[PDB]
Design an enzyme around this catalytic site. Structure first.
Site, PDB file in Angstrom:
ATOM      1  N   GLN A   1       0.652  -0.831   0.556  1.00 23.95           N
ATOM      2  CA  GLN A   1      -0.042   0.045   0.387  1.00 23.95           C
ATOM      3  C   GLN A   1       0.910   0.845  -0.085  1.00 23.95           C
ATOM      4  O   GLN A   1       0.473   1.920  -0.693  1.00 23.95           O
ATOM      5  CB  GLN A   1      -0.951  -0.553   1.017  1.00 23.95           C
ATOM      6  CG  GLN A   1      -1.790   1.335   1.144  1.00 23.95           C
ATOM      7  CD  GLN A   1      -2.906   1.074   2.414  1.00 23.95           C
ATOM      8  OE1 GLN A   1      -3.044   0.260   2.956  1.00 23.95           O
ATOM      9  NE2 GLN A   1      -2.903   2.426   3.199  1.00 23.95           N
TER      10      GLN A   1
ATOM     11  N   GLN B   1       0.887   4.033  -2.837  1.00 23.98           N
ATOM     12  CA  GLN B   1      -0.029   5.222  -3.144  1.00 23.98           C
ATOM     13  C   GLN B   1       0.929   6.423  -2.983  1.00 23.98           C
ATOM     14  O   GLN B   1       1.167   7.200  -3.655  1.00 23.98           O
ATOM     15  CB  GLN B   1      -0.501   5.259  -1.812  1.00 23.98           C
ATOM     16  CG  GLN B   1      -1.742   4.847  -1.309  1.00 23.98           C
ATOM     17  CD  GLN B   1      -2.587   4.926  -0.300  1.00 23.98           C
ATOM     18  OE1 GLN B   1      -4.042   4.086  -0.609  1.00 23.98           O
ATOM     19  NE2 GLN B   1      -2.153   5.276   0.518  1.00 23.98           N
TER      20      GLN B   1
ATOM     21  N   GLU C   1      -3.392  -7.812  -2.250  1.00 23.02           N
ATOM     22  CA  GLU C   1      -4.535  -7.675  -2.399  1.00 23.02           C
ATOM     23  C   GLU C   1      -4.748  -6.084  -2.889  1.00 23.02           C
ATOM     24  O   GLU C   1      -4.097  -5.038  -3.441  1.00 23.02           O
ATOM     25  CB  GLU C   1      -5.266  -6.657  -0.633  1.00 23.02           C
ATOM     26  CG  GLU C   1      -4.838  -5.656  -0.471  1.00 23.02           C
ATOM     27  CD  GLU C   1      -5.575  -4.743   0.400  1.00 23.02           C
ATOM     28  OE1 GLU C   1      -5.095  -3.866   0.692  1.00 23.02           O
ATOM     29  OE2 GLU C   1      -6.619  -5.035  -0.546  1.00 23.02           O
TER      30      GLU C   1
ATOM     31  N   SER D   1       6.874  -0.037   2.644  1.00 26.25           N
ATOM     32  CA  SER D   1       7.000   0.648   3.810  1.00 26.25           C
ATOM     33  C   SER D   1       7.643  -0.795   4.083  1.00 26.25           C
ATOM     34  O   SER D   1       7.380  -1.951   4.211  1.00 26.25           O
ATOM     35  CB  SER D   1       6.259   0.476   4.613  1.00 26.25           C
ATOM     36  OG  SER D   1       5.624  -0.867   4.518  1.00 26.25           O
TER      37      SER D   1
ATOM     38  N   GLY E   1       4.851  -2.766   6.594  1.00 30.14           N
ATOM     39  CA  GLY E   1       3.829  -3.590   6.234  1.00 30.14           C
ATOM     40  C   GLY E   1       4.544  -4.626   5.933  1.00 30.14           C
ATOM     41  O   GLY E   1       5.252  -5.038   5.826  1.00 30.14           O
TER      42      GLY E   1
ATOM     43  N   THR F   1       3.652  -6.821   3.150  1.00 31.89           N
ATOM     44  CA  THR F   1       4.510  -6.511   1.600  1.00 31.89           C
ATOM     45  C   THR F   1       4.783  -5.949   2.009  1.00 31.89           C
ATOM     46  O   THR F   1       6.973  -6.990   0.802  1.00 31.89           O
ATOM     47  CB  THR F   1       3.274  -6.989   0.647  1.00 31.89           C
ATOM     48  OG1 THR F   1       1.810  -7.163   0.838  1.00 31.89           O
ATOM     49  CG2 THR F   1       3.248  -6.468  -0.808  1.00 31.89           C
TER      50      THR F   1
ATOM     51  N   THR G   1       0.228   2.155  12.553  1.00 27.11           N
ATOM     52  CA  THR G   1       1.170   1.271  12.133  1.00 27.11           C
ATOM     53  C   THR G   1       0.306   0.194  13.429  1.00 27.11           C
ATOM     54  O   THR G   1      -0.611   0.187  14.000  1.00 27.11           O
ATOM     55  CB  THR G   1       2.493   1.507  13.541  1.00 27.11           C
ATOM     56  OG1 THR G   1       1.938   2.881  14.841  1.00 27.11           O
ATOM     57  CG2 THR G   1       3.511   2.913  12.387  1.00 27.11           C
TER      58      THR G   1
ATOM     59  N   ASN H   1       2.160  12.110   1.386  1.00 29.56           N
ATOM     60  CA  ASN H   1       2.000  11.414   0.265  1.00 29.56           C
ATOM     61  C   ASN H   1       2.563  12.448  -0.626  1.00 29.56           C
ATOM     62  O   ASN H   1       3.456  12.693  -1.512  1.00 29.56           O
ATOM     63  CB  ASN H   1       1.433  10.928  -0.404  1.00 29.56           C
ATOM     64  CG  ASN H   1       1.849   9.564   0.216  1.00 29.56           C
ATOM     65  OD1 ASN H   1       2.760   8.613   1.180  1.00 29.56           O
ATOM     66  ND2 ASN H   1       0.051   8.665  -0.130  1.00 29.56           N
TER      67      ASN H   1
ATOM     68  N   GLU I   1      26.050   6.110  -9.583  1.00 35.62           N
ATOM     69  CA  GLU I   1      26.620   7.507  -8.817  1.00 35.62           C
ATOM     70  C   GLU I   1      26.158   8.218  -7.393  1.00 35.62           C
ATOM     71  O   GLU I   1      26.787   8.604  -6.251  1.00 35.62           O
ATOM     72  CB  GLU I   1      26.799   9.124  -9.405  1.00 35.62           C
ATOM     73  CG  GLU I   1      27.238  10.444  -9.731  1.00 35.62           C
ATOM     74  CD  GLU I   1      27.379  11.252 -10.601  1.00 35.62           C
ATOM     75  OE1 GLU I   1      26.487  10.778 -11.692  1.00 35.62           O
ATOM     76  OE2 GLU I   1      27.772  12.260 -10.206  1.00 35.62           O
TER      77      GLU I   1
HETATM   78  N1  LIG Z   1       3.625   7.922   4.398  1.00 35.57           N
HETATM   79  C1  LIG Z   1       2.465   6.411   4.019  1.00 35.57           C
HETATM   80  N2  LIG Z   1       2.944   5.735   4.620  1.00 35.57           N
HETATM   81  C2  LIG Z   1       1.469   4.276   4.590  1.00 35.57           C
HETATM   82  C3  LIG Z   1       1.485   4.853   3.626  1.00 35.57           C
HETATM   83  N3  LIG Z   1       0.112   3.694   3.987  1.00 35.57           N
HETATM   84  C4  LIG Z   1       0.712   2.387   4.468  1.00 35.57           C
HETATM   85  N4  LIG Z   1       1.791   3.166   5.365  1.00 35.57           N
HETATM   86  C5  LIG Z   1       2.812   2.980   6.053  1.00 35.57           C
HETATM   87  O1  LIG Z   1       2.680   1.397   6.063  1.00 35.57           O
HETATM   88  C6  LIG Z   1       2.898   0.868   7.105  1.00 35.57           C
HETATM   89  C7  LIG Z   1       1.679  -0.431   6.990  1.00 35.57           C
HETATM   90  O2  LIG Z   1       2.269  -0.866   5.770  1.00 35.57           O
HETATM   91  P1  LIG Z   1       1.549  -0.744   4.351  1.00 35.57           P
HETATM   92  O3  LIG Z   1       2.113  -0.395   2.879  1.00 35.57           O
HETATM   93  O4  LIG Z   1       0.021  -0.318   4.787  1.00 35.57           O
HETATM   94  O5  LIG Z   1       1.480  -2.971   4.027  1.00 35.57           O
HETATM   95  P2  LIG Z   1       1.308  -3.877   2.902  1.00 35.57           P
HETATM   96  O6  LIG Z   1       2.611  -3.153   2.285  1.00 35.57           O
HETATM   97  O7  LIG Z   1       0.100  -3.142   2.214  1.00 35.57           O
HETATM   98  O8  LIG Z   1       1.425  -4.820   3.603  1.00 35.57           O
HETATM   99  P3  LIG Z   1       0.519  -6.325   4.266  1.00 35.57           P
HETATM  100  O9  LIG Z   1       0.530  -6.460   5.302  1.00 35.57           O
HETATM  101  O10 LIG Z   1      -0.123  -6.882   3.358  1.00 35.57           O
HETATM  102  O11 LIG Z   1      -0.981  -5.156   4.059  1.00 35.57           O
HETATM  103  C8  LIG Z   1       2.247   1.608   7.900  1.00 35.57           C
HETATM  104  O12 LIG Z   1       3.650   2.258   9.523  1.00 35.57           O
HETATM  105  C9  LIG Z   1       1.876   2.791   7.668  1.00 35.57           C
HETATM  106  O13 LIG Z   1       1.828   4.478   8.101  1.00 35.57           O
HETATM  107  C10 LIG Z   1       0.940   6.093   2.853  1.00 35.57           C
HETATM  108  O14 LIG Z   1       0.731   5.545   2.154  1.00 35.57           O
HETATM  109  N5  LIG Z   1       2.008   6.997   3.222  1.00 35.57           N
HETATM  110  C1  LIG Z   2      -3.953  -3.637  19.483  1.00 36.26           C
HETATM  111  O1  LIG Z   2      -3.586  -2.506  18.450  1.00 36.26           O
HETATM  112  C2  LIG Z   2      -4.465  -2.961  16.883  1.00 36.26           C
HETATM  113  C3  LIG Z   2      -5.813  -3.255  17.200  1.00 36.26           C
HETATM  114  C4  LIG Z   2      -6.667  -3.975  15.877  1.00 36.26           C
HETATM  115  C5  LIG Z   2      -5.849  -3.391  14.600  1.00 36.26           C
HETATM  116  C6  LIG Z   2      -4.840  -2.673  14.749  1.00 36.26           C
HETATM  117  C7  LIG Z   2      -4.347  -2.583  15.490  1.00 36.26           C
HETATM  118  N1  LIG Z   2      -2.328  -2.132  15.014  1.00 36.26           N
HETATM  119  C8  LIG Z   2      -4.688  -3.264  12.968  1.00 36.26           C
HETATM  120  O2  LIG Z   2      -3.343  -2.760  12.388  1.00 36.26           O
HETATM  121  O3  LIG Z   2      -5.438  -3.263  12.439  1.00 36.26           O
HETATM  122  C9  LIG Z   2      -6.497  -3.759  13.088  1.00 36.26           C
HETATM  123  C10 LIG Z   2      -7.810  -2.528  12.660  1.00 36.26           C
HETATM  124  C11 LIG Z   2      -9.321  -2.595  13.370  1.00 36.26           C
HETATM  125  C12 LIG Z   2      -9.209  -2.074  14.580  1.00 36.26           C
HETATM  126  C13 LIG Z   2     -10.303  -2.445  15.243  1.00 36.26           C
HETATM  127  C14 LIG Z   2     -11.517  -2.986  15.419  1.00 36.26           C
HETATM  128  C15 LIG Z   2     -11.576  -4.744  14.007  1.00 36.26           C
HETATM  129  C16 LIG Z   2      -9.948  -4.279  13.544  1.00 36.26           C
HETATM  130  O4  LIG Z   2      -9.396  -4.852  12.091  1.00 36.26           O
HETATM  131  C17 LIG Z   2     -10.366  -5.095  11.647  1.00 36.26           C
HETATM  132  O5  LIG Z   2     -12.652  -5.180  13.723  1.00 36.26           O
HETATM  133  C18 LIG Z   2     -12.422  -4.757  15.087  1.00 36.26           C
HETATM  134  O6  LIG Z   2     -12.514  -3.950  15.688  1.00 36.26           O
HETATM  135  C19 LIG Z   2      -8.357  -1.249  15.219  1.00 36.26           C
HETATM  136  C20 LIG Z   2      -7.561  -0.608  14.312  1.00 36.26           C
HETATM  137  N2  LIG Z   2      -7.579  -1.184  12.991  1.00 36.26           N
HETATM  138  C21 LIG Z   2      -6.781  -0.495  11.712  1.00 36.26           C
HETATM  139 MG   LIG Z   3      -1.953  -3.842   2.237  1.00 37.98          MG
END
Ligand SMILES: Nc1nc2c(ncn2[C@@H]2O[C@H](COP(=O)(O)OP(=O)(O)OP(=O)(O)O)[C@@H](O)[C@H]2O)c(=O)[nH]1
Ligand SMILES: COc1ccc2c(c1N)C(=O)O[C@@H]2[C@H]1c2c(cc3c(c2OC)OCO3)CCN1C
Ligand SMILES: [Mg+2]
Ligand SMILES: Nc1ncnc2c1ncn2[C@@H]1O[C@H](COP(=O)(O)OP(=O)(O)CP(=O)(O)O)[C@@H](O)[C@H]1O
Ligand SMILES: Nc1nc2c(ncn2[C@@H]2O[C@H](COP(=O)(O)OP(=O)(O)O)[C@@H](O)[C@H]2O)c(=O)[nH]1
Ligand SMILES: [Ca+2]
Ligand SMILES: [Mg+2]
Ligand SMILES: [Mg+2]
Lengths: 439, 333, 422, 53
Positions: A11, A15, A71, A140, A143, A145, A179, A228, A254
């Protein structure tokens, strides 16, 4: 002319890539349909902008980019967005279910099933390059991925394109910006596996971008779009040398040559100025001395840290706008007398300067105001190791209890890779200490 | 409610600051490893400045300036004064750094010039274990540190014909205001000064630990070999027809301001993601001409017994509550 | 990201029915399956819980299970009774008589294959099955015994899918039979092994909230279920509506479950239900208050491993962060320090019906051990004298199986206490 | 304060100012991925064996 292929993973990578290519098109006069009126060589050419865009017989300028995500929801917005016409479907690659913030899931489980497809989509872009320099990889740390699949891709890229350079733009995790809890795990795991495969990586801490958006753009709750577009301004400043006529940082090699004396220490710190709010009615334009001085303010760095308590190995000044060498040296001299700028003994105390006369381009209706001159400083400072120390400490807190480890072992990863990766980070931290600290 | 942590249990000054913080009812102490603190009373060695200021929503303050070691290490203080254009310097004794870069040749060059010139050639060697001698060969063989001209003509208190040094406590807040606690202390030698016997290091070494041990007339003239300003000022008026302020304090204030302003650009937390303050202990010498000499700066000083309450209260008002308001004893330089 | 919903037994189907009523309203689906909403946010992730039929009809991806027809006839006669797929009603005629052995081993075994046939048909029409959610009680026979048998058989056929339950814990304050501790202990054994996430809904807490907070002198199951459906709608908002972060059941489990066995969550909700909207500080204070927890456990008696908080309505997201950061920063002693940033906050613009804003709390707290201690004590009080065991030995079970389930639950308790002292 | 290597074009100019002088093979990757797959296979076989019991 030598081509560059950009790769956006997860993601964050996707983005951010959207923001960069939106900005690239504005800077090169390319419309969302891919047409470019100022380009008089229809269906071909080897101009500077051709390192990032290929040309079709119909006059469309197509980015040399690949978007990969496990995804489809994020890449589906590109397919139906403002720049849907720019890319063709082969470039946009999506799976069905993501890595659920799990490095092991993105690297081993899902990565194994899609890695060959990604490489073949990449190979097809390479086959269009008369002379490929290498790859720019956006992702990232946190993430599943962005961390797990990127590390796999980087390994295979070294196998399929050994002589080619690979640069990273990596998003460092910040709790302010959505995060996951396990992002320290994913950050260390992916840094360990990618370290020997990356020639130069630009880390962008979301905490730093977040605060710059609040402080300088007066945005109470910055969105990903806000973040972004600012990130893409810095990325554009870093890649402008590859896309425009110039003599500094003209090829990927370079970057390592100028910013990375020792291979493992390949994480330059980026500082950008000025960031001015577009909503700001009355604004006074900053000078060359003032924007250059701001490059030594921690509040303007992409990673919060204190360079005063580290040592420099290389410093590059990249100006865009109304700037002349005379004013740069004047500002540098003054800043030398007022700032703590300690270089390592085995390196020259100097600055490689690059000036592009075209002032920065800003997205219409965005948060950034048009300015007459801007500068991005790339300096290899041992101070950036503070970000490794913070990250390693969070890793230590959770791993001491083995918290969440079972999610990674359940995907086929061995617990040993945790300690292996952590030991590598400990060595990295020690390398920074040997280079920039006095007993 | 404000939160803080303690990471130096061996700090007498901040054990009282910690204590006072609780009495206010608006401060709560946390475990030493909890990152969600507003205030950190950090350890002396390897304080992790790199982890400060990254907790969202928390304004974080620490009681040490990163980089202040440059001033508070005997070796680095000498290098700082020599290589700093704002110091270059008439109030710091001629000092040289000697490893067991090195300044051996430069030290002996000045040493020889003094020898033939008939001038007093007594030097003192010390490190971060003290040797006082007039033979350079004995000084260097002991090191195998910093060699510094030994002030042979110190101002001697009467009666007793005895040596002393002055300790000044200085607080630097997050705004880099320099606050000089208006209460100092003199560490007094209870042994008469003997300029012909450097072998006995009791009438020559001012340390309270040396006087309490080797000195046999310890505590004769003042309680604990500590004389405070009110008494010292009255003595200067009776014996020398001058005041502590005119004869000494002007120079002390000048020296304090010169050292701290010199290093300000390197340690200031003005535009930093975390804030710093620190209590410093300046140690001065006074010669028979009423000239003040800087001896060293201590970055983790203890306080005089009868001064802990006032000073520690001053730290909360000026350094802590100024960043975290609740619901002067200092001289601003 | 399709979810397959299963509701088993009396409690499971009555709570399940209300859930579908509530979220159908939030998404603009009427009792006939027709969409009449005014916002595209209602349909953006509507497929997570609904299928699309000819004529733009939305059909819940829900399977209704029971060993007697009574409660499911009620559902079919309820307000939204006609919205469920007729083929997804799976029921027998004998009942389970509040007997775990009957639900799990004898009566339920006869019917389980029919349920798996319907589950299979729902899963096969999923673009990418996210996982399963099951509503049931632990104190009865069908939801508890057959419900956990279903979970075991779903795991065998879908071992790589997430299993999520809303499990109603029995309480002497709201009791039907004295064997509820037997049925609950046997079930918790199953849940500890075969679910990834379990919302512990304690009927003792639901009663206390109705009696003490809502000032209902004589709470009924209908009143208790009002609190459950509001909680279920809350803890599924992040799955049902577009957000800054796209979150599914597996990402929830990864971030909420640091150790596989400790996957039992305390839910909370504010405001407890007036025309005066609450301020963000009020929502935050109440959602963390013990009196708002759906599991009768004192959070101050343990420590939080992880927390998720969902805010619904139009409010200051800046003020939300300030108050959420305020809660952790001023109560740091109740959050384990060895999981950095273990409190995640989310916001959804669309509020629940009847409220301009609300807050839903999901806590993985070691205090939940008090719930299992309570059940364990009631279990042992009877088991030490083998009281009422003949109802179970008469269905083929022997005492050893009861001893194992008790030991496993007491181990779970010891695990929570182990990390409460970390 | 020396300036060196001044390059000028119509779109800008660059120069340097000095203030003071001074991998795993494809086979090994495939084994890693396949080794992780086998471990996932073994764990699932244990689960299915446990469920069969
Ligand atoms: N600066 C910036 N950070 C992002 C963005 N999207 C996600 N992040 C950061 O990326 C981290 C999470 O990684 P993602 O890129 O969302 O996850 P992913 O690479 O899609 O991998 P998955 O777990 O499969 O979804 C978190 O720390 C987010 O703050 C974005 O559009 N801009
Ligand atoms: C302890 O911290 C965390 C808790 C939950 C989440 C994360 C996380 N770091 C996280 O990144 O994904 C989940 C996800 C989530 C939340 C609440 C929800 C829920 C969720 O997922 C479907 O389903 C039932 O209510 C809150 C945050 N959100 C992005
Ligand atoms: Mg993703
Ligand atoms: N150049 C000099 N001339 C005269 N006396 C000196 C001197 N240098 C040091 N001394 C004496 O030696 C004593 C200790 O020297 P030193 O600088 O090492 O203090 P110290 O660090 O050992 C303990 P403190 O932290 O209280 O200063 C001083 O109190 C002073 O009396
Ligand atoms: N909250 C709630 N609890 C219920 C409801 N119906 C039954 N229970 C509880 O569930 C247990 C009885 O199980 P039940 O579902 O009736 O038996 P089953 O049909 O065999 O699954 C007892 O602890 C009851 O207190 C209900 O509608 N709401
Ligand atoms: Ca062309
Ligand atoms: Mg000292
Ligand atoms: Mg019943």
């Amino acid at each position: 002319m030598r081509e560059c292929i950009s790769i956006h993973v997860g993601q964050a990578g996707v983005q951010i890539g959207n923001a960069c290519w939106e900005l690239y098109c504005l800077e090169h006069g390319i419309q969302p349909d891919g047409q470019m009126p100022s380009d008089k060589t229809i269906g071909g050419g080897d101009d500077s902008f051709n390192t990032f865009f290929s040309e079709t017989g119909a006059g469309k300028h197509v980015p040399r980019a690949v978007f990969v995500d496990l995804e489809p929801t994020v890449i589906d917005e590109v397919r139906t967005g403002t720049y849907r016409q720019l890319f063709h479907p082969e470039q946009l690659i999506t799976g069905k279910e993501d890595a659920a913030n799990n490095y092991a899931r993105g690297h081993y489980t899902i990565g194994k099933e899609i890695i060959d497809l990604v490489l073949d989509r990449i190979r097809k872009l390479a086959d269009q390059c008369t002379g490929l320099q290498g790859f720019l990889v956006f992702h990232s740390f946190g993430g599943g991925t962005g961390s797990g699949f990127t590390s796999l891709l980087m390994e295979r890229l070294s196998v399929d394109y050994g002589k080619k350079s690979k640069l990273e733009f990596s998003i460092y995790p910040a709790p302010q910006v959505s995060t996951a809890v396990v992002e320290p795990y994913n950050s260390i795991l992916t840094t360990h596996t990618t370290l020997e495969h990356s020639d130069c990586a630009f880390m962008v801490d979301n905490e730093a971008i977040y605060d710059i958006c609040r402080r300088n753009l007066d945005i109470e709750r910055p969105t990903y779009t806000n973040l972004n577009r600012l990130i893409s301004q810095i990325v554009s400043s870093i890649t402008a040398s590859l896309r425009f006529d110039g003599a500094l940082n003209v090829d990927l090699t370079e970057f390592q040559t100028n910013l990375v004396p020792y291979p493992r220490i390949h994480f330059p710190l980026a500082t950008y100025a000025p960031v001015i709010s577009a909503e700001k009615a009355y604004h006074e334009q900053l000078s060359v001395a003032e924007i250059t001085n701001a490059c030594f303010e921690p509040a303007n760095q992409m990673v919060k840290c204190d360079p005063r308590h580290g040592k420099y190995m290389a410093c590059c000044l990249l100006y865009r706008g109304d700037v002349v060498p005379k004013d740069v040296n004047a500002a540098i001299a003054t800043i030398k007398t007022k700032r703590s700028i300690q270089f390592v003994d085995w390196c020259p105390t100097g600055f490689k300067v690059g000036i592009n006369y075209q002032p920065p381009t800003v997205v219409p209706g965005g948060d950034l105001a048009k300015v007459q001159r801007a500068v991005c400083m790339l300096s290899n400072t041992t101070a950036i190791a503070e970000a490794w120390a913070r990250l390693d400490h969070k890793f230590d807190l959770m791993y001491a209890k083995r918290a969440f480890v079972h999610w990674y072992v359940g995907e086929g990863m061995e617990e040993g890779e945790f300690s292996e990766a952590r030991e590598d980070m400990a060595a990295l931290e020690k390398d920074y200490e040997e280079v920039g600290v006095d007993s | 409610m404000y939160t803080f942590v303690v990471r130096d249990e061996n700090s007498s000054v901040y054990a009282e600051v910690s204590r006072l913080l609780l009495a206010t009812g608006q401060w709560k102490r946390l475990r030493k490893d909890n990152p969600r603190f507003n205030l950190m009373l950090g350890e002396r060695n390897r304080l992790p400045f790199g982890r400060l200021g990254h907790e969202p929503g928390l304004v974080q303050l620490v009681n040490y300036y990163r980089g202040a070691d440059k001033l508070c290490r005997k070796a680095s203080l000498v290098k700082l004064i020599k290589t700093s254009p704002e110091l270059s310097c008439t109030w710091f004794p001629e000092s040289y750094v000697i490893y067991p870069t090195d300044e051996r040749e430069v030290f002996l060059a000045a040493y020889n010039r003094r020898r033939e010139g008939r001038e007093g050639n007594v030097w003192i060697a010390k490190s971060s274990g003290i040797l006082i001698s007039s033979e350079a060969s004995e000084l260097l063989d002991f090191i195998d540190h910093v060699i510094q001209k030994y002030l042979e003509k110190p101002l001697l208190l009467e009666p007793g014909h005895r040596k002393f040094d002055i300790r000044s406590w200085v607080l630097v807040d997050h705004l880099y205001n320099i606050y000089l606690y208006r209460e100092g202390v003199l560490r007094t030698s209870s042994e008469p000064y003997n300029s012909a016997n450097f072998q006995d290091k009791t009438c020559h070494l001012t340390n309270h630990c040396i006087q309490k041990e080797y000195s046999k007339n310890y505590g004769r003239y003042e309680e604990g070999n500590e004389m405070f300003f009110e008494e010292f000022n009255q003595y200067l008026m009776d014996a020398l027809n001058t005041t502590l302020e005119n004869s000494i304090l002007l120079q002390i204030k000048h020296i304090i301001r010169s050292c701290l302003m010199c290093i300000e650009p390197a340690i200031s937390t003005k535009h930093l993601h975390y804030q710093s303050f620190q209590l410093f202990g300046f140690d001065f010498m006074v010669d028979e001409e009423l000239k003040v000499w800087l001896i060293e700066v201590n970055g983790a000083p203890a306080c005089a017994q009868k001064l802990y309450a006032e000073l520690c209260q001053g730290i909360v008002d000026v350094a802590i509550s100024s960043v975290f308001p609740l619901a002067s004893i200092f001289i601003k330089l | 990201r399709e979810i397959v919903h299963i509701q088993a037994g009396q409690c499971g189907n009555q709570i399940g029915a209300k859930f579908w009523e509530v979220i159908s309203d939030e998404h603009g689906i009427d009792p006939t399956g027709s969409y009449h909403g005014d916002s595209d946010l209602q349909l953006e992730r509507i497929n997570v819980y609904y299928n699309e039929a000819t004529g733009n009809k939305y059909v819940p991806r829900a399977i209704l299970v029971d060993l007697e027809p009574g409660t499911m006839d009620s559902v079919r006669s309820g307000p939204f009774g006609q919205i469920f797929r007729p083929d997804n009603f799976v029921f027998g005629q004998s009942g389970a008589g509040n007997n775990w052995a009957k639900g799990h081993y004898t009566e339920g075994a006869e019917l389980v294959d029919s349920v798996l046939d319907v589950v299979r048909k729902e899963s096969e029409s999923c673009d990418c099955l996210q996982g399963f959610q099951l509503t049931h009680s632990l104190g009865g026979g069908t939801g508890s015994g057959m419900g956990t048998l279903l979970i075991s058989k779903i795991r065998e056929e879908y071992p790589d899918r997430i299993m999520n339950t809303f499990s109603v814990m029995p309480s002497p304050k709201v009791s039907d039979t004295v064997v509820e501790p037997y049925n609950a202990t046997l079930s918790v054994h199953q849940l500890v092994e075969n679910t990834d996430e379990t919302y512990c809904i304690d009927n003792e807490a639901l009663y206390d909230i109705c009696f003490r907070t809502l000032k209902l002198t004589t709470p009924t199951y209908g009143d208790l279920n009002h609190l459950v459906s509001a909680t279920m709608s809350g803890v599924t908002t992040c799955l049902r509506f577009p957000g800054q972060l796209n979150a599914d059941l597996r990402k929830l489990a990864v971030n909420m479950v640091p150790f596989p066995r400790l996957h039992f969550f305390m839910p909370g909700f504010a405001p407890l239900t007036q025309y005066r909207a609450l301020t963000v500080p009020e929502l935050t204070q109440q959602m963390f208050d013990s009196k708002n927890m759906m599991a009768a456990c004192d959070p101050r008696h343990g420590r939080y491993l992880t927390v998720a908080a969902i805010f619904r309505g139009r409010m200051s997201m800046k003020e939300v962060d300030e108050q959420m950061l305020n809660v952790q920063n001023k109560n740091s002693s109740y959050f384990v320090e060895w999981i950095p940033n273990n409190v995640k906050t989310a916001v959804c613009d669309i509020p629940p019906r009847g409220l301009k804003m609300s807050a839903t709390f999901i806590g993985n707290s070691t205090a939940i051990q008090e719930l299992f201690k309570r059940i364990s004590e009631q279990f042992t009080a009877m088991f030490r004298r083998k009281a009422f065991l003949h109802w179970y030995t008469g269905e083929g079970m022997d005492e050893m199986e009861f001893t194992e389930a008790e030991s496993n639950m007491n181990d779970l308790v010891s695990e929570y206490q182990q990390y409460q002292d970390a | 304060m020396e300036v060196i290597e001044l390059n000028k074009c119509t779109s800008g100019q660059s120069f340097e100012v000095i203030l003071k002088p001074p991998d795993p093979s494809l086979e090994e990757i495939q084994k890693k991925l396949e080794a992780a797959e086998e471990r996932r296979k073994y764990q699932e076989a244990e689960l299915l064996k446990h469920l069969a019991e």
